[PDB]
Design a protein around this ligand. Structure first.
Ligand SMILES: [Mg+2]
Ligand SMILES: [Mg+2]
Lengths: 223, 218
DNA sequence: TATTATAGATCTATAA
DNA sequence: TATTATAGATCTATAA
């Protein structure tokens, strides 16, 4: 997929280039993953698939020596049980669940940084938060990149957090032939059990009009 | 219901006593609302009902001039569309959704404070966040008071936020008969349409010698 | 086995 | 009616 990046607290000057390269290469290689919605009135419509996307990233990063689901130390257990990935001094959270998780993940990362807890036998120095762009139709209230950008931009203006964060947004060109992974799961909601997965051709239709102030999400189609 | 309070950034001295009285008297007179779980291993077991609780609070506060769902001004629209209630300079969030909402609600309150946005014709000065105690069985990942206290306590230890916040936890004594409102909605999940509602007596059974209790009605 | 605590998925409710 | 937006509700997945 394509990516857009926004850096906070100089994450760009802090993030190890090799560690970033491993993350970047994985996200650039990755095709857009879609699945059928079960939302009323749009049953069967294609939406961004967070299950497939998360599994792809896990399958790519673990072999690159990023540890998955690193436990959070008992002294911070009220902040959670684990972090998605980590390698050396870098933590990564892939966040496609509902929007408040952006601030939950941001604030807990701040506290981890303030106390310098270890990520991978090294104190934490920077966090990467992966999100999907607004352009893709998706479950209601799932976090999207522009939303995260706007919120973190405001927190930065007001000096709310000092931890370096590289915010990544997964995007694609509109109205362009691209390869898409389309997955069918064993149940219409929540299942992570694959029934069928195929790589197909598709594109993202731009449904904006001169009056929609670019808020319309695209329509995904596959052939 | 009974209540427990934890204050941050001196909300105890900053919060207007009269405004607090209006919120407190509502929470104190309110019966515990419960409904059936639709979770796979426990279909039918009684759990805290956020729908009934939220509606009860709205029905009490709106007549007392607390505006509901006040729109958030366009300049802060990336923080959301509305706030649950506000009166004068005080914002109230009733939060029974999933736990990350606690930090989302806290951070946006901090920004509303830093930027002085108007709540009800006055700039925001204090937030009240209402939550339910861990003691009640409830949907998975729904926020509970002790978790909120632990997180805000840690943020306060590290001097992360400055906005005054009064955190309220709704609780009951265990093993004591109390008033309960038990409701059946039109659909087993999400519905806010009441099909049947009964006011009954019941209690929260404790198996502790911290585990959650079991709610029963009579 | 059976229960929890997240974490993640993803729905409906509601207004603009 | 169709879409946007959260906000709220509340499920399953997974491991401890
Ligand atoms: Mg994640
Ligand atoms: Mg609320």
């Amino acid at each position: 997929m394509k990516i857009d990046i926004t850096d906070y607290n100089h994450a760009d000057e802090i993030l190890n280039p090799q560690l970033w390269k491993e993350i970047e290469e994985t996200l650039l290689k990755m095709p857009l993953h879609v699945k059928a919605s079960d939302q009323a009135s749009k049953v069967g419509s294609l939406i961004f698939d967070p299950v497939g996307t998360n599994q792809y990233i896990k399958d790519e990063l673990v072999p690159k020596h990023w540890k998955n689901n690193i436990p959070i130390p008992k002294r911070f257990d009220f902040l959670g049980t684990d972090i998605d990935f980590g390698k050396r001094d870098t933590l990564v959270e892939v966040q496609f669940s509902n929007y408040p998780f952006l601030l939950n993940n941001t604030v807990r990362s701040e506290l981890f940084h303030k106390s310098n807890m270890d990520i991978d036998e090294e104190g934490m120095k920077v966090a990467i938060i992966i999100t999907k762009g607004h352009m893709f139709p998706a479950s209601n209230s799932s976090l999207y990149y522009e939303q995260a950008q706007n919120q973190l931009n405001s927190l930065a203006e007001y000096n709310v957090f000092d931890v370096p964060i590289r915010l990544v947004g997964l995007i694609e060109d509109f109205e362009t032939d691209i390869d898409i992974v389309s997955t069918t799961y064993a149940d219409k909601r929540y299942s992570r059990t694959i029934t069928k997965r195929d790589t197909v051709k598709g594109k993202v239709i731009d449904t904006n009009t001169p009056n929609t102030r670019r808020r319309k999400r695209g329509t995904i189609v596959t052939y």
